[PDB]
Amino acid sequence: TKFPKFSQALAQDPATRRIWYGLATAHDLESHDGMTEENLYQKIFASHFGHLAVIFLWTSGNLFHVAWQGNFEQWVLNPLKVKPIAHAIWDPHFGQPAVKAFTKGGVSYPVNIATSGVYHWWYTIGMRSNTDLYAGSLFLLFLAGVFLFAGWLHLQPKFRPGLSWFKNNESRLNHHLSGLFGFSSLAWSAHLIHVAIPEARGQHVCWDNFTKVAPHPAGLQPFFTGNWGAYAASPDTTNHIFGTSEGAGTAILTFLGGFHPQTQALWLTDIAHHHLAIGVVFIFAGHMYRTNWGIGHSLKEILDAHRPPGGRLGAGHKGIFETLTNSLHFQLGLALASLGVITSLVAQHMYALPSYAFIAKDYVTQSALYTHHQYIAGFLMVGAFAHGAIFFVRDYDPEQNKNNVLARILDHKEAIISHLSWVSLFLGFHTLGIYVHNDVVVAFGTPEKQILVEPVFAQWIQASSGKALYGFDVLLSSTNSVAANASSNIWLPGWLEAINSGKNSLFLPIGPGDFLIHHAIALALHTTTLILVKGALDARGSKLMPDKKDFGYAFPCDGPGRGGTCDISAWDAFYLSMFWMLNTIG
Amino acid sequence: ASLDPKTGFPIQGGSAGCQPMTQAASILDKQRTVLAGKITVAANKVPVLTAAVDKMKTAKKPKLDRDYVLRYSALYLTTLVDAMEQYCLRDANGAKAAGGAGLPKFKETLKPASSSSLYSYVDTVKSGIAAVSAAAKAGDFDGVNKAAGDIKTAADSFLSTANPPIIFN
Amino acid sequence: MTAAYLPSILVPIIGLIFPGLVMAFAFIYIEQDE
């Protein structure tokens, strides 16, 4: 009668529904009884520190279980032949055939073989022994403790941040771009240049010697003279055996492109130069906003002034600043849409451009990593549209958003939804019809009759990046081109070797089957968007239920009247689009 | 009384009381047991290389794995030399190598790892690394085996003359 | 494996005692009124 202490409506329910609903509404802090905005942002802040710590405990656990029970030191000696161990098995239900069957990995105990790729990642970034995997596990346990104490500390009365702090958009953006994105990318270049690059070249560098071991023989004198190209001189040879001194160069920043010939991964000097470039860029981008010294941009001023004079967007973005800041669901939706696109980029760019040594020969790891991150991508993208629907129901004020981009999106909600319905139907009818045409004709013994459409547009894109398979002779594929000539002295020789060689997943050959499946994925992405967009736009009302906003985000129905209102809530369009997300990632 | 064969940690407790408040050991002695333990781990992994090279030679068609031999050299043999050089540094200059001169830096202005009584064994291990690599390029299985044995003898000799204090702490 | 005793000691504790205890306490907390 007191378990949902945040809900008196559930705590007085005499049924078993109280337990379920108290468990399912626990993290929806906005709906809790007597919830102010101060307390809402401060509990979200402290529970974000708890998520930070859980992530660090999870990573410390992976490092500890590999340091303790893995075969990391055996694997680093021979990374193409040894199978990485995740952790050991102690299961009292096993038979002795099961115990013998799982005793692979070169050890004397049953084990799970890791599909996470953490061995290839820890190998590439410097870790060599079990002692440093364990040291990383210890450091993450310390960091988890630091962020658990920070979560408790920022719940204390003197250390409780105000709402003015939580909505300082300019200081948070300045610090997250220049410190969290930029300086930590710059610090990651430092880790590669100081640790990962020397230890890929046989020279051990740890805390014991890294202030007395120079990453470059010249050493911070070319940097402080403008002689920056001296850091690219003498790169790693094509004879380099990763982890050893033979074939090693002295460069710490290159733009060679392509892949290390042995590990079949991106050059670590390319990765160090990438994070240095992207670091400086993000650090510069983190000086954009005005905080305390009179230079910079006000986000309010930028949003208010971006109304096209033709009037095609109405009032434009007037009032979007307030809506975003006041609405945690609008922020979550932007964050999740943004994050979902990135973990899709992570999945697509890590199989085609692997960064870790001797991965892309670990076919199980490549398959598991791609599948894992695409499923995470589909969940994040569906959740972004879910929290856009929750934004419209709970945080969207039409009077504060008069004739904005948001109001005008709702004004044409039916044009958007009906054209998504059209494109979904268009693609579905034809893609399925061509597939069924092909099935029927092949079944009837006539494979030639199949409608096989070449993916020429994508092939032209591959050729434009230098694939010579299709003979397009466009841009990089053409030797005498402005694009080809420009990159010839820098990244093109390596890239052309990588793209044209068929030993890698870079711009894999595409044919009629690829075309048909891409159109199937287009139908799936458009149909999941249709369901999610229909849910978000009709969240606040529809002809069937005009006052849908008054009922919330997740309600069962409006009853059997008006023909029947099952699955009419915006939550129910989340529910229906979750199947379409699973189908598309499938 | 000795260091563990695999983990390299102090093995047994066996007024120089081991208990923290009463410990008589210096931070230099504790750094020396850390270095000696790391030397022990690296030296005791030399049998693993010897076994691998024997497996390579007895195969139906035998080829030396230059990648395995060079990666083992990079992972353990270079580590063994650096740990021995540091022990020689602490033995010769004294407390200065323990942080008495500050953070590790270039131009540290301290006595070199050479001129130490124990340095000759470090020279033997350096010759062993060179032989391990030269044999791997040559394809000589016997060369790798004898060179690893030379390293194993040198590291054991180093530890015996060093007589490192084992600080259980 | 070093500390090979720990999987035998912890996996039954974490897998049987931990849930049993936290389920028992969770049951007491959800059912209780004051």
Binding site: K43, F149 | - | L6
Partner: peptide, 30 residues
């Protein structure tokens, strides 16, 4: 390889993390 003492240090630091987790969970719960 990892010593039993090294595992015990990891278990000490994870117990400290457990106590800080209890303290954060009680603070968030109020």
């Amino acid at each position: 390889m990892i010593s039993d003492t090294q595992i015990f240090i990891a278990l000490i630091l994870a117990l400290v993390s457990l106590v800080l987790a209890i303290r954060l969970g009680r603070a968030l719960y109020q």
